[PDB]
Design a protein around this ligand. Structure first.
Ligand SMILES: [Zn+2]
Lengths: 56, 123, 112, 44
RNA sequence: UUAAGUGAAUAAGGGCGCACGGUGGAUGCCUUGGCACUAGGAGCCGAUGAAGGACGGGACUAACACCGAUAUGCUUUGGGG
RNA sequence: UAGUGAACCAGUACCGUGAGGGAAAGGUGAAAAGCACCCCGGAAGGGGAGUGAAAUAGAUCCUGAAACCGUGUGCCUACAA
RNA sequence: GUAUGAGUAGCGAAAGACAGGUGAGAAUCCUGUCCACCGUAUGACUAAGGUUUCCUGGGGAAGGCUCGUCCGCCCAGGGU
């Protein structure tokens, strides 16, 4: 159909309380202590389970 | 199963990716393609343990014919053809290994599409 | 004696609603953790506020401050830049406009 | 689905040219009417 | 300790007041252009080729202006330093 | 947004095969003295240091209202038509 | 001039995958390999019509319905 009215400034914001970006698990490494993702290959470290994996 | 595309296109996809790793042993792709390549590669190394004619004449499905891989000469130009590599190298590598010939590692999302990406290796 | 160096980036070619999403996640935190926070979000507005914070850190080093490990992101803005305006040929003869928007982004880095 | 403005080079100048606005007393009205505004292209 | 009764405080978000910013060019001031007239001049140009134009000329040259193979100009008479 | 349609390279750009129809667009400072040099970044863009009486006069450049978009905070708000 | 609709509808019929380049940055540029589509045509030559889009070397503010180191786009030479 066609919207009947202008929605006010209040119901702009009362929708958008579920329009967020959130960040999931951030572990710290072993070889550098740097904040990186759980279960993921540590990119700057190049290690995972203490192994030169991304090498080659 | 995991539907990805139409019917015959999945056969094309998995013959593409699983005739790779026979040649290179590393592959960088997405997540779900790696799981289908898990299953199909490990089903096509157990034929590399047998060495019969049925080992060859069931490898006529998931092997691209004219595909080379050379680290080889004596005084010649002599060419392994990526199925010979199964029946001469990868068989005797995992002659004593049971199932589970692969690794899947979780690196990064792709820049273009935020598709998370994945490394496959063997040992 | 002054703290809290500034850094801006004007008329960045990104939409101003979407870049307010990321700056939800930075206000009030330490500097050394928020960069790691920024490096994992997969957005176009990720790889810009990185450059804004790194220029703010370089300002605080080479002009006034010390103590990079003791810096707090205290303020961060998103404002609207000027908008380009173009059209698109829509069916049955007529046409409907298309906005293209730009934003201004500032981040202030106090010590504590 | 043929649409109209299908050009030639002959027909533009043997309808809308110069000589076929000099060979009347109405083409001269056209030319001396455009020269009042002083437009660049007097005719095609 | 039991039982009956009384009940504050916090906000995922929002409203009002204040304070500071960003887009956007109203308004204040201004004039390089117009409008309406006054007094005087002048009221035609053209086969000796008109009005209006096309193409070319500069050290570099896209455009405007000026000029015309003697082409960003030539001769002479007066002014001026 | 007045005054010629036109103070700006205008009967131009643009539209119709054609006769024809026809816009928008003025303002740094007294003087360009229009930011040497350093710093982050591929650049754009900014922060110092300078020019200037004034840079929130930095070339979209005098003053800079309203709708509209944000940041921070004094008070209120989850039995309410 | 700016909102609401709303970060919604849409992104204009098709088959791609890997390795190695270059690069601040890569699904989208280059190279290789195999796979796939048309094949009285999605192949070759020409008449109008368009009017420099053609070739060589550089560039990424805008155009490209995303990206873009690339282009029928921009800069500079040069070919009929
Ligand atoms: Zn690590």
């Amino acid at each position: 159909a066609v919207p009947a009215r202008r929605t006010s400034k209040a119901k702009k914001a009362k929708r958008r309380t579920h329009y967020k970006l959130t960040i999931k698990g951030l572990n710290a490494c072993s070889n550098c202590g740097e904040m990186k993702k759980s279960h993921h290959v540590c990119p700057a470290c190049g290690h995972y389970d203490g192994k030169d994996v991304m090498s080659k | 199963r995991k539907l990805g595309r139409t019917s015959s296109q999945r056969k094309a996809m998995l013959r593409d990716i699983t005739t790779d790793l026979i040649i290179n042993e590393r592959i960088v792709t997405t997540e779900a393609r790696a799981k289908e390549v898990r299953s199909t590669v490990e089903k096509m190394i157990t034929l590399g343990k047998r060495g019969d004619l049925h080992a060859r004449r069931q490898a006529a499905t998931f092997v691209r014919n004219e595909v080379a891989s050379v680290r080889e000469e004596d005084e010649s130009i002599v060419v392994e053809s990526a199925l010979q590599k199964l029946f001469n190298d990868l068989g005797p590598r995992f002659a004593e290994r049971q199932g589970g010939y692969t690794r899947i590692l979780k690196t990064e999302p792709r820049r273009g599409d935020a598709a998370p990406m994945v490394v496959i290796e063997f040992v | 004696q002054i703290t809290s160096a500034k850094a801006t980036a004007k008329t960045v070619r990104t939409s101003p609603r979407k870049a307010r999403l990321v700056i939800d996640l930075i206000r009030g935190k330490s500097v050394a953790d928020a960069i790691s926070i920024l490096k994992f979000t997969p957005n176009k507005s990720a790889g810009i506020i990185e450059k804004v914070l790194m220029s703010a850190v370089a300002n605080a080093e080479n002009n006034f401050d010390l103590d990079v490990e003791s810096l707090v992101v205290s303020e961060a803005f998103v404002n609207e830049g000027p908008t380009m305006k173009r059209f698109r040929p829509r069916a049955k003869g007529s046409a409907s406009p298309i906005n293209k928007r730009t934003s201004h982004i500032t981040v202030v880095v106090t010590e504590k | 689905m043929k649409r109209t403005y299908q050009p030639n080079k002959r027909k533009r100048q043997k309808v809308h040219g110069f000589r076929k606005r000099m060979s009347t007393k109405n083409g001269r009205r056209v030319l001396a009417s455009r020269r009042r505004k002083g437009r660049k292209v007097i005719s095609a």
